[PDB]
Structures are given as C-alpha cells and as structure tokens.
C-alpha cells in the first residue's frame, strides 16, 4: 500500500489533501504531550568525563537508579546534557513510517533495523477519568466508530488518542508482538511509551499485545496472522 513519514503530519492542509486521496490516515489533532480534561530527587550516577563521553560510553545507562525505577532524569541530572535517560522528554523516537495494512487500517513499520528494548514512541492523548471514559465509549459506539484508541495509564486514568494524539496511535495489536508498553515517570507524572521487545528488521510492522480488559463476549476480530492468534482484540 501507500506509506508516509512522521514529518508528513506536520503540514495540516497537505495532510488533509493526502487524506482525500487515501495516501495518509484521516485527520486528527497532533499533540506532543498528554492533555488532561481533569486538571491535575536526582539519581546517583557519577558524572562522566568529557573523555568518557568521547569514547562512546553511556551516561545514566543500565545501573542508573532513576532508570531502574523507570523514572526519567531531569535537567539537573549529574550527567546534564549527556544523560541517555530523558528519551520521552527529548522525543528520541525510533525511525518508523505509517503504512496501510490489508485489514487493520493503518499501521506502523520500522524504517531501519531497531535493537531490543529500543524506545519507539510515546502514546500521547487526552487523559480521562472513569466517567469521561464511559461517556466516550458510548459516544463512540453511537457514532459507529471502527477504530478505538483507548490505553489504560493508571487507576482512573485512560488515554484516548481518538481525536488528539501522535503517530503512536497507529500501532496495531498482535497476539505475537514485537513491542510492549512501558509506563515511565516524567516530572512526577506517569506516561506510556512503546518499546521493542526484540530486534525488528527494516520494513516489519510494529505490534504490541493490547490487553485492555474486554467488557462483553463481543469483540473485534484479530487479523494478526500469528500461529497463536487468540482470535479477538483485548485481554
Ligand atoms: C489504535 S488503533 C490502531 C490504528 C488503526 N489501524 C487505524 O487505522 O487507525 C486500534 C484499532 O486498529 C484496529 N486493529 C488493530 N490491531 C488489529 C488487529 N490485529 N486486527 C484487526 N484490527 C486491528 C482495530 O479496529 C482497533 O480498534
Ligand atoms: C491502542 C490500541 C491498539 C490496538 C488495539 C486497540 C483497541 C483499543 C480500544 O480502545 N478498544 C476498545 C474497543 C471498544 C471497547 N468497548 C467496550 O468494551 C464496550 C462495548 N463493547 C472498549 C475497548 N485501543 C487499541
Ligand atoms: Zn543516572
Ligand atoms: Zn540522568
Ligand atoms: Zn491475533
């Protein structure tokens, strides 16, 4: 099918044009941070020498205490500019494209090879309390929407990327996936991002195991094509 790049989403009227020809997904409002309907210490890594920075060595890598608790550092981190643990904030996203699938709608694929436990994208959207969430479920059912964009963030917080979000919203489900969600604390506030669970060759679709609690017996069928396909979306 047709494909497109994350920069294509920055030109609104051209996008809408590409959408008229079916060369891009339908329009949504692009945002770079979660938006709320309901109004809401440093680590101990030793500073790296300028020599160690030049050698290729990692600042706040795997032993960093902020990182081990999936907390990103701030500006006041000991390693300052060198800190590798500010990925959400610096928007250090993987190189991925938005493509048209056979039966799932649009999707995400890797433009380059991507290592294991590599950051893909933040799942951004409108954060909802339980009440707003239920309002929208019903509103969406009554508009006969086909695609749904809900992601559980925490107790009484669900991200809805139906109207406002970013390209994370195109990652499809798979019963045998190559990414997972991770919840990270940034400035005392929780966020969700997608991360590879294995190596993902260039061209391959990126998928995760969506486990949002299924309500009815009734569900969306799964066209993931795996050997182990559970048949439907949801947990
Ligand atoms: C967040 S969206 C993913 C983006 C969607 N493909 C689009 O075109 O906007 C989730 C929706 O994609 C579709 N979807 C995702 N994974 C799927 C799968 N494995 N089989 C069938 N539909 C899928 C479902 O309609 C679901 O409600
Ligand atoms: C981010 C992402 C990636 C891949 C798949 C999904 C599905 C969703 C999603 O929001 N699914 C919803 C469906 C409609 C349900 N409706 C009821 O349970 C009540 C009446 N059937 C709620 C869950 N989000 C996704
Ligand atoms: Zn650190
Ligand atoms: Zn740091
Ligand atoms: Zn499946």
Question: Do residues 195 and 118 lie in contact, with contact meaning Cβ atoms separated by under 8 Å?
Answer: yes
Burial class (CB in 10 A: 0-12, 13-18, 19+), 38: exposed
Q: Which residues of 191-221 are buried (b: 16+ CB within 10 A; e: fewer)?
A: bbbbbbeeebeeeebbbbbbeeeeeeeeeee
Closest C-alpha residue for ligand 2 atom 1: 149
3-state class (DSSP) for residue 153: strand
Nearest residue to 121 (alpha-carbon basis) of 192, 69, 62: 192
CA angle, corner 35, sides to 151 and 64, nearest 5?
70
Q: How many domains does the chain have?
A: 1
Q: Is 93 in the pocket of ligand 1 (CB under 6 A)?
A: no
Ligand 1 centroid vs 12 CA: distance in angstroms? 23
Domain range for 162 is: 1-235
Ligand 2 centroid vs 13 CA: distance in angstroms? 29
CA distance 109 to 97: 5
Pairing of strands 96-100, 106-110: antiparallel
* Resolution for this experimental structure (Å): 2.3
Q: Report the nearest atom of ligand 2 relative to the CA of 216.
A: 21
3-state class (DSSP) for residue 15: helix
Ligand 4 centroid vs 61 CA: distance in angstroms? 8
* Residues in contact with 201: Cβ distance below 8 Å, sequence separation at least 6, in sequence order: 110, 113
Q: Is 137 in the pocket of ligand 2 (CB under 6 A)?
A: yes
Q: 83 a known binding residue?
A: yes
**CA of 228, nearest ligand number:** 5
Method: X-ray
According to DSSP, residue 233 is labeled S
């Amino acid at each position: 099918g047709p494909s497109c790049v994350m920069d294509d989403f920055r030109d609104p009227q051209r996008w809408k044009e590409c959408a008229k020809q079916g060369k891009m997904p339908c329009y949504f409002d692009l945002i770079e941070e979660n938006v709320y309907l309901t109004e809401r210490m440093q680590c101990e890594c030793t500073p790296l020498s300028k020599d160690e920075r030049a050698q290729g060595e990692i600042a706040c890598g795997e032993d960093c205490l902020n990182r081990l608790l999936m907390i990103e550092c701030s500006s006041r981190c000991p390693n300052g500019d060198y800190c590798s643990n500010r990925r959400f904030q610096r928007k250090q996203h993987a190189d991925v494209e938005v493509i048209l699938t056979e039966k799932k709608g649009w999707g995400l694929r890797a433009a380059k090879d991507l290592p294991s436990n590599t950051f893909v994208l933040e799942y951004c959207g409108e954060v909802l309390d339980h009440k707003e969430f239920k309002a929208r479920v019903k509103e969406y059912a009554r508009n006969k929407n086909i695609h749904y964009y809900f992601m559980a963030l925490k107790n009484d917080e669900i991200i809805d990327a139906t109207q406002k979000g970013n390209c994370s919203r195109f990652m499809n489900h798979s019963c045998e996936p190559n990414c997972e969600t991770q919840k990270w604390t940034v400035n005392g506030q929780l966020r969700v991002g997608f991360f590879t669970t294995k190596l993902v060759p260039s061209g391959s679709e990126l998928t995760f195991d969506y486990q949002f609690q299924r309500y009815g017996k009734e569900a969306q069928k799964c066209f993931c094509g795996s050997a182990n396909c559970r048949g439907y979306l949801g947990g």
